[PDB]
Amino acid sequence: FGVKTEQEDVLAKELEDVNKWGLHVFRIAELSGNRPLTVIMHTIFQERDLLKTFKIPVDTLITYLMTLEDHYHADVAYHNNIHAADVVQSTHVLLSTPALEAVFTDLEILAAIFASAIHDVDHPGVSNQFLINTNSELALMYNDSSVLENHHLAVGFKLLQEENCDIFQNLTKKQRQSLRKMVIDIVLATDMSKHMNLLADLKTMVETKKVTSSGVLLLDNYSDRIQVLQNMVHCADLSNPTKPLQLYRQWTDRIMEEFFRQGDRERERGMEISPMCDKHNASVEKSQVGFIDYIVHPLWETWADLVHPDAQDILDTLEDNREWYQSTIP
């Protein structure tokens, strides 16, 4: 035909919000036939001219993206392809913040976006500790240390070896070694066990923050550049409470479903039920308020400082949503 179907047109129209915080990611998931990660990644790669810059064949990119997306679990309520697509898209927006204009190279941009896409791939919907406590083969392989995060990376990279999936086939060895290091550094930093140190270092950078004559941040060395990228993607991963409440609440429903399911498995097995995984002793609203007060607000406040005043609306929304959950505590 050569013209879009009406569903494809409606999808294209939704994708016009790809550069906006609060993209209707769940509608995109539905409209795309459960291919939000593929369609959002493809849109972002085109928008950023990544295919031309890195000589990525388009069929190779689509094959890889579908393969990656296929290895997110459809039965996992939160850590699935919709979450991945959300984190990609959120990272995409954070990358284009005025305070960061012309700071990152195309390869660093590629790293952050690719890292976002793969960062939860093959997540079983249970915690590292559950995998450790059950003596899972995964935990055995990874010595109980960032078990899932190591796995997400290993899977993300391994899938490049499937038929016509090597999207990095035209990168030089130098580009590939650099890209790989950055991707690993970013995804391993998504382990919540690393949050406090990641935030401490972000704070230290905001303390010593330097800005150019152009007004954007100055990042001289790899340590500062990767730290900002790690924190950016970590912010994207922890961005749900900063979204419009209609979106945020769907994420809360999902994380609670995933948590309660793990709790049910723990109970079944006679294991102690992990924090916030007990459907019979839950405080969904109190827990979101605590999540925000102790983890998300501290991070986003510091990010908002780093990129002042770019993230002011995101922070305002976070505080509005915090107050809404607070107001709903029974």
Ligand SMILES: COc1ccc([C@@H]2CNC(=O)C2)cc1OC1CCCC1
């Ligand atoms: C929308 O809420 C939440 C969204 C995301 C996360 C985790 C952050 N990183 C992950 O991999 C999942 C926790 C949430 O809420 C917590 C408080 C109550 C249950 C867990």
Ligand SMILES: [Mg+2]
């Ligand atoms: Mg994760």
Ligand SMILES: [Zn+2]
């Ligand atoms: Zn995630």
